[PDB]
Symmetry: C3
Subunit: 270 residues, 3 copies
């Protein structure tokens, strides 16, 4: 892995800047239709970016709702074995590219008993189990260029962005699907046992997933404002103690794409 | 360091198959109480890990672990005598490999015992707590044994851990205990893994108890996860080798020797229990 | 460099060639203890840079030998926090070196977030127990081959925070008129270096944790493992925010400042504890 220090991040950023003229203000990490809505877009496969982590995923530049965006199509999940530096690099690259707001979605298990399949849970906070347990993405020498040794995670999930997202949902008639909640990261890749889910629920967790927190931590560390939503893709089984016709349509994607586009449209500009 | 991929697992499996004709249906990982199990194995071949190329090496004080093939209650078994505990510093691949080797050897059921601290206040020293579920603290915390490239040959990227502790096997174990007059010693419970090797502080025990944990140990889950991942059915029991101290203001301290002593004392019972379970496993 | 008997001996032997002081008490300066080293008399200051095979922190930390309240001490000025990326062996080595040097009692301070709602900024929370989240999660400092020379494979953490030393510390606080600042509590280690989210703090609090920090437990574990008695205190350098809706937050400069304000008190406290430690 190449260290996510100022020097390497600059190199990758500079390379990307030679491929696109688009200075992204908003970065989006796709937990997939979004990219499709992007206009006047350049698609840069990771494979074409020297020193960029490989998953091939694409970096997509263009405009969305009249805003310059960089979209990550292909994430680096820790359960895959990616290093802290590999996961951190793209976010820090976004920082150097001009990204001020990071919007991310993920799939999560609904722990909260009031959640419904396909609900949206806006992250208003998280519990970073790996981070509490000495697998925090920031462990290692602090990269001072990007942020402080001991980042505070207060307002990690920008309250204004959260308010905005909620309003946009409300206005476009799907406020009923939208919740705010605490996301706990399970390092994965095992789904959580019922005992784990029960514990996580009782810990005050609403949704559980294997992603996002590390990117959020890096983003916050370098001052990028964060908006994150979990799609409740399954209801966690809490009880350790018959198949039907199932529709698994990418309609949450369309809704979520629309939601993101409409949020981006209303983001304050400069 | 040898990756627990299809290629290496096959190599080890193939080597073992050149040493024994026994195709094991049941794999048994001897924890505590099970030291004796191996002894009951009939028509057995004992294959020290040292004699298996690319097989992980363990030792009990310099004495290499053994893979023991033979029959038990008329069933072909492979018995692991010598486990790889993560607190020893073994890698994910080192711990996973033997289970995947068992898979290739024909193992369909994994039976494992371990020593555990009794968190549940209703547990008694030497009670048997059948795992009906677990809390994989290392797993939640980014030290899951499956972290890394998924080995597709063995199982899926995101294994579900529903019915990880096969409910039918649990039911069977309980019946066998009941029938042989020690149902009173047998509980089902949630096992939480402490990575270890420190025993849990009273504050840790209190927390774990309040998290809904019944017993705590430093083993087993990683093997269970690998087993489940490759579709091996799992039966696991904790011997309550000590009652967890929940109160920091207290003399009573966990110690490995007492732990070994409870295993030693219950080993015969547990051996018998396992043998009688194996006897009634569907074939 | 593995913290085995051989390497620890080498480092210890080197140090013993630099100082005649056989330390009975080792002190790890956290927060409130920058000053401690200053009170040390007849002291030799050995920068880590001058100790072959000794871990390097910073500039450069010092090993300080001398007497404090008439007792021979070794003071660590410069710790190895796991969030910096130090290995188990790097963190364990100095403690094991202390063991070989003659250390019988380890006194350590740290900065911590006050989870317990009854805590005040600048309170002292004596550790009476801990929750070693990294340890529960397979990042225990002892993971790896056990170094038998130093201790057992499965150390018990009963009375990890020596009750007698805790009693003493409380008495000393009481006698010197700051018992009101002194609490005993459960310390939970967050691996860090992020401060805890409000959701994390809430969880930790409900887990029965009183203070949260990113240090100490690994040293305590190594100390206990090799039979060194442990006394540990957290300075409450910030009150944990439990509510995400709250502009209010941890500020590291305020942590440092709060720590520093109490250093004199904490130095005095430690000196007065050391003074009353039973001797041989
Ligand atoms: N983690 C752990 N804790 C306790 Cl109390 C034990 N007693 C026997 N094995 C054990 N493993
Ligand atoms: N992990 C952690 N949390 C809080 Cl509130 C702290 N305050 C001082 N050091 C600290 N370390």
């Amino acid at each position: 892995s190449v260290t996510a220090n100022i020097e390497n991040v600059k190199k990758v950023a500079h390379h990307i800047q030679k491929l696109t003229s688009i200075v992204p203000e908003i970065g989006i990490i796709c937990g997939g239709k979004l990219a499709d809505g992007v206009k006047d877009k350049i698609t840069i496969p990771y494979t074409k970016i020297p020193n960029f982590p490989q998953t091939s995923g694409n970096l997509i530049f263009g405009t969305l709702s009249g805003r310059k965006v960089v979209v990550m199509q292909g994430r680096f999940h820790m359960y895959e074995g990616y290093s802290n530096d590999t996961v951190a690099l793209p976010i820090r690259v976004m920082k150097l590219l001009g990204v001020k707001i990071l919007m991310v979605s993920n799939a999560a298990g609904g722990l909260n008993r009031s959640l419904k399949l396909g609900d949206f849970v806006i992250l208003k906070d998280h519990i970073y189990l790996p981070g509490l347990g000495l697998n925090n993405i920031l462990v290692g020498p602090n990269q001072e260029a990007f942020g402080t040794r001991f980042p505070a995670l207060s307002n990690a999930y920008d309250r204004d962005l959260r308010k905005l997202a909620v309003q946009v949902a409300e206005e476009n008639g799907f406020g009923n699907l939208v919740h705010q909640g605490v996301y706990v990261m399970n390092g994965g890749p095992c789904y959580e046992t019922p005992a784990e889910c029960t514990m996580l629920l009782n810990m005050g967790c609403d949704v559980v997933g294997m992603s996002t927190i590390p990117e959020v931590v890096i983003a916050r560390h370098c001052g990028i404002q964060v908006f994150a939503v979990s799609l409740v893709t399954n209801i966690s089984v809490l009880d350790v103690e018959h198949e039907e016709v199932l529709a698994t349509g990418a309609q949450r994607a369309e809704l979520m794409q629309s939601w993101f586009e409409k949020i981006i449209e209303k983001l304050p500009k400069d």
